[PDB]
Amino acid sequence: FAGFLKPLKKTVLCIFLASLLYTALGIAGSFYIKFLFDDLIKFEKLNDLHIISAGFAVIFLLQIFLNYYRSILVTKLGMSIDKSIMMEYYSHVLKLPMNFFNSRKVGEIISRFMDASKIRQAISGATLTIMIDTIMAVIGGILLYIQNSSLFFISFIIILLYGIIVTVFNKPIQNANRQIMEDNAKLTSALVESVKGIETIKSFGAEEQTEKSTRDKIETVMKSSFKEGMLYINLSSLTGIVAGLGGIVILWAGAYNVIKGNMSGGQLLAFNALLAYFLTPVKNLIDLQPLIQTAVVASNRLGEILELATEKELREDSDDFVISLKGDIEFRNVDFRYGLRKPVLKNINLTIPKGKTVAIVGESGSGKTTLAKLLMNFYSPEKGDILINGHSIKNISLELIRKKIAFVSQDVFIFSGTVKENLCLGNENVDMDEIIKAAKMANAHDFIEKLPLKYDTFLNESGANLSEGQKQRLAIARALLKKPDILILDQATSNLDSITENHIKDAIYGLEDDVTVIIIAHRLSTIVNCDKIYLLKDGEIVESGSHTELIALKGCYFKMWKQTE
Amino acid sequence: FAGFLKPLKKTVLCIFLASLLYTALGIAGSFYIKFLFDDLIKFEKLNDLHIISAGFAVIFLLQIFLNYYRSILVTKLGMSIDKSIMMEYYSHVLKLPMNFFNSRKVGEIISRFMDASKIRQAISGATLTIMIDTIMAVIGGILLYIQNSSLFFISFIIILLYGIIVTVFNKPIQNANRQIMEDNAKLTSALVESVKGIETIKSFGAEEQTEKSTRDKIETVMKSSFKEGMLYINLSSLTGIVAGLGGIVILWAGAYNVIKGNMSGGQLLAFNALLAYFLTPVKNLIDLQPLIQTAVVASNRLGEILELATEKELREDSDDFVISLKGDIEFRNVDFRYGLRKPVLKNINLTIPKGKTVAIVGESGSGKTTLAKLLMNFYSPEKGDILINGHSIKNISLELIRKKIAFVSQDVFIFSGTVKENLCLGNENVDMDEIIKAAKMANAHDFIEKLPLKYDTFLNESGANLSEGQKQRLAIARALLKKPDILILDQATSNLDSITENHIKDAIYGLEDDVTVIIIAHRLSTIVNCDKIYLLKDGEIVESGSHTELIALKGCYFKMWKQTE
Ligand SMILES: Nc1ncnc2c1ncn2[C@@H]1O[C@H](COP(=O)(O)OP(=O)(O)OP(O)(O)=S)[C@@H](O)[C@H]1O
Ligand SMILES: Nc1ncnc2c1ncn2[C@@H]1O[C@H](COP(=O)(O)OP(=O)(O)OP(O)(O)=S)[C@@H](O)[C@H]1O
């Protein structure tokens, strides 16, 4: 932020100077009105009155144009800083590991986004008011000091009361602001989650469930909002009391100083205009009380960004100095728990050969996702390690692991946009020949040409038209187009059996076992065709081998095949 | 609003009267200050000065307490109305058909939510300032009219200029407001999409894609925001010109009327304070012009929410009062396309028997999910119809169809909450015996007891712990707990092969075919295990029968089995 401020120092200087001159001329002109009223009655001058009026009008106009240009500049700078900050936050939250994202929901990050944004705009208008109030405080302080000692005492009392009330209401406001932010976050989150699960609830029939949920959320949010609003109105009332009593005191002391022979009536009116130039600042503080809430929101945003900065330094934490392309993958004495108790791996030792197609068969929940996750460094391992290309996974570059290794998810995600792009996610500037070759190999090419707008059909949230089989085939197409050094596939064949049989035959033919292959499938029948197989049982690896040797082994796999196949 | 007025008329009257009287006393006390400075100081009466000052102070205090209580009440009412409206909108968008959900994305509804909310709060502060401005405008108008003709002319000119500028900037503001709303909505949508697909992006490696995307969205949003802000600053500058020139004119004409013998200096000051009691309205209007944008956004939001409430109960226009329990489901000459071209169903003739299990096997893209949607009345059929229990689906009650028919999805969704509740979605106040029996039958009961907090484990998204097999088993468990008159199951077994195999033996044994069964599975053998089978080929039904008869038929199904089995 400081660097950005430095790169806008000249604009800041222009704004500062313009503000100072504008405020000076403004006070001068209000005192021009004072002298106007004071001179015209004592000396009775019509022409001089007209001329003076014109002059003061001109002064006011110049002041107004200055405040105009200044406000424009400060607004531009403010909004620029806002955009920069928001983008930084979003980017830093994007580069975060799987654990931090899994620990929370979409609603959280989205709520934080919108809230922090609004807080930022509020911060830029607060910024404008801040510049004006600062300059007015300096100028007003000098002018008030010079103009009248007793009036300066009054102004000092007013400023003191204003400050005291403002701070004493400031401390309490931030907390309720945080609470309100939390409530709005929860409500928005429930809204998003309910929106996604629209099909589940519309089909199930439970509308009253989410209705009551949103009712409770809206109720609590309304309660907190009413509390904070009441506090704000209390603050406004107190500051209004200080200001008003300040005015009355100013009028009384003005009359007193007038009749005592200490000051003139024109000095009283001038005291009213310099009162405008001293009280302008405190009113700005009473308006600033709302900015404090935005500042609290900013504290929350910075706390979130501190959290976002966390899992950025862990991706780099293990450093790099390797330049490997594709290695043999072994798991050695692993013992990691993705939770407090009930470890996913109590002991897992596995081995997949370079240039060999491998299959891992286990039911859903056994340990199919964990292997791919551990290889991808999605979830770090607490105890024990793994070896890739004759090197630990910790030392390997995460970007190269990301690009060269492909993971086929059971739940494929497609971001809104053209199908060609959603298919070409990951690798940018990819030749159409490779994408068309992958599409042709994925056996989905027919379902790609069947689309209305060829390849550029709008695909938004599995909409408008989309097949699960075509989707998994598209995932496989992406994995193929990426030219993977390591290929991990879940039970994609299991998603849509018939077309998946053909497309799996085609993909198995295409693979040629030129690289390591992982299977997160439970379908034993589909995995037997593969070259080699590993077995995951009760969180522990049993025996590595082929279907024939494993079945002839007469162990647990043979028991599984006897029990199911 | 009318209903709120009826339920709060006395309070509203109290607030209005309090505002009028308070403002009156304010003007009176301001004229007390006028007479104070002009008469008491000039004629030199100290005691009267002190006493008068005290009195006017008291008047001001009473005014302040009145405005306080009024503002509190109006705030409460405002926020209540806000909550009501928001809840109504969300509820009406929840009860909407599948077509509206498919037509848009989460980002849309979420954006509308947040925007309409902020607009509502803005509407309550605009409401407070509006009440004060109205009452003060009436009193100030009368008093100004009586007090001085020329000053009234000045005030009239000021009000005229204010109104003209305000409207002429008002019309243009709403458009830019709509644009800003659209851009911000797009940004929020990109945010939500990025949030859901976090795993997809972490896996793919493409961070620069969403980074540049959100950068562009933020850029356009910043452009529109800066434009609207510039317009607002222009408005503020113009209104400021009107106000300032109004003041200068007031001072000059005041001096003129003073020296002419038409008015006193005290009459001039009183004219300035009653000017404050007329200008109270114009500052409020200047604040209302910025509020006007929020009001426009609220209007757009109301337009968006008004259109959505249509297709919730008007789609059937046939009434209900039907009491079927469980019927036979047949398809007759159906021809519906869920898109402009490429119809999903060109012709569909089918017949499903009461108390009989049916299985339909087809690849990804054939039309089984579309069929299930048609049975659920999720998507209505353009041409042709379907018959249930000797009655059209159009005439049947959608709620009874919702509760009595259960669909097990291939793509499982889990809403945030306790596992017991997520499992007991749909039917409220369900006995624990039925849920435990369904869990025991779903074979997931073991994986339910394996959980840390038994049944009350937190289930939010795919975190912290969740299995696909356990998920589909949970869907089946929910379907069982609902006590369905019609059971539609997708390839749930195909999601997670092994545990689904055991649980399929147990559940298929459990079903006992006491009701109609639909299959959206592609696994031909597992569906072959079922009682009767239907065939979907190229969007048209071929032949209904059993595996033996269909295979022996030597048609297309036999060709399919030759090609795959
Ligand atoms: N709402 C829709 N509007 C238009 N076309 C659709 C729509 N939903 C699906 N489709 C089309 O129908 C196909 C979707 O296949 P589905 O049968 O619905 O699902 P699926 O891939 O068969 O999943 P399973 O597990 O086999 S039931 C694609 O070819 C789409 O083009
Ligand atoms: N708290 C947790 N955090 C992260 N992962 C977890 C947690 N608890 C369980 N898991 C993992 O979640 C996975 C369950 O994935 P499943 O889908 O049920 O298995 P699967 O065989 O991969 O089925 P598919 O083909 O991937 S759909 C297991 O591999 C567990 O290790």
TrEMBL record, chains A, B:
Binding site for ATP 2: Y338, S364, K368, T369, T370, S467, Q470
Amino-acid positions noted as binding ADP 2 in the UniProt annotation, renumbered to this chain: Y338, R341, G367, K368, T369
UniProt binding sites for ADP 1: N102, Y338, G365, S366, G367, K368, T369, T370, Q410, A464, N465, S467
Binding-site list for Mg(2+) 1: T369
Residues bound to ATP 7: S364, G365, S366, G367, T369, T370, A464, S467, G469, Q470, H522
Limits of the ABC transmembrane type-1 domain: 15-294
Domain ABC transporter as annotated: residue spans: 329-563
UniProt binding sites for ATP 1: Y338, R341, G365, K368, T369, T370, Q410
Binding site for Mg(2+) 4: T369, E468
Entry's localization field: Cell membrane
Record: residues binding Mg(2+) 5: Q410
Keywords, ordered alphabetically: ATP-binding, Cell membrane, Hydrolase, Membrane, Metal-binding, Nucleotide-binding, Protease, Thiol protease, Translocase, Transmembrane, Transmembrane helix, Transport
GO cellular component: plasma membrane
Residues annotated as binding ATP 9: G365, K368, T369, T370
Residues that coordinate or bind ATP 8: S364, G365, K368, T369, Q410, A464, G469, Q470
Binding site for ATP 5: Y338, S366, G367, K368, T369, T370, S467, G469, Q470, H522
ATP-binding is among the record's keywords: yes
Designated name of the protein: ABC-type bacteriocin transporter
Organism expressing this protein natively: Acetivibrio thermocellus (strain ATCC 27405 / DSM 1237 / JCM 9322 / NBRC 103400 / NCIMB 10682 / NRRL B-4536 / VPI 7372) (Clostridium thermocellum)
Entire protein: shown range: 158 to 722 of 727
